[PDB]
Copies of this chain bind each other. A is one copy, B any other.
Amino acid sequence: RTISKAKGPPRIPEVYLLPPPRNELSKKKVSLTCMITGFYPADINVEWDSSEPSDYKNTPPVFDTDGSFFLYSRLKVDTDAWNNGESFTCSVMHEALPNHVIQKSISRSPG
């Protein structure tokens, strides 16, 4: 269970952030993500933290023209229990040829 490739499994070298911006709420609906994308071959996995509270679920490959691949994964807590509750992290390991990366944080928020 292995191959090599085409257009390109292995090369498109980057990591992402999308933190609680300019958007007016009360504790309850708005959440954010981690994005890792333009990469074949057909498999890579995403974990965030290692533990899961309520909502950490994966946004499935979306591959773009040239796009070679697109992954997006998200996290929420729910609202009014942010600061210390999970001051938070995202991890990626995409085998097909190993790259194990970590990038973390947040700034702003529900305020």
CB neighbors of B among A1-43 (8 A) = 12, 14, 16-19, 21-23, 25, 29-30, 32-33, 37-38
A22 to B22, CA, bound (A): 13
Let me know if B32 and A59 touch, CB within 8 A: no
Residues of chain B within 8 A (CB-CB) of A29 are: 12, 14, 37-38
Contact of A33 among B18, B22, B25 (CB under 8 A): B18
Q: A56 CA to B33 CA in the complex, in Å?
A: 18
Interface-facing stretch out of A64-72, A83-91, A93-101: A64-72
Is B59 touching A55 in the complex (CB atoms < 8 A)? no
| Chain A interface residue count, Cβ-Cβ cutoff 8 angstroms | 30
- Complexed CA–CA distance, A76 and B70 (Å): 12
Which residue from chain B places its CB closest to the CB of A37 in the assembled complex?
B29
A62 at the interface (CB under 8 A from B): yes
CB of A60 within 8 Å of the partner chain: yes
Seen from chain A, the residues whose Cβ lies within 8 Å of a Cβ on chain B are 12, 14, 16-19, 21-23, 25, 29-30, 32-33, 37-38, 54-55, 57-60, 62, 64-65, 67, 72, 74, 76, 107
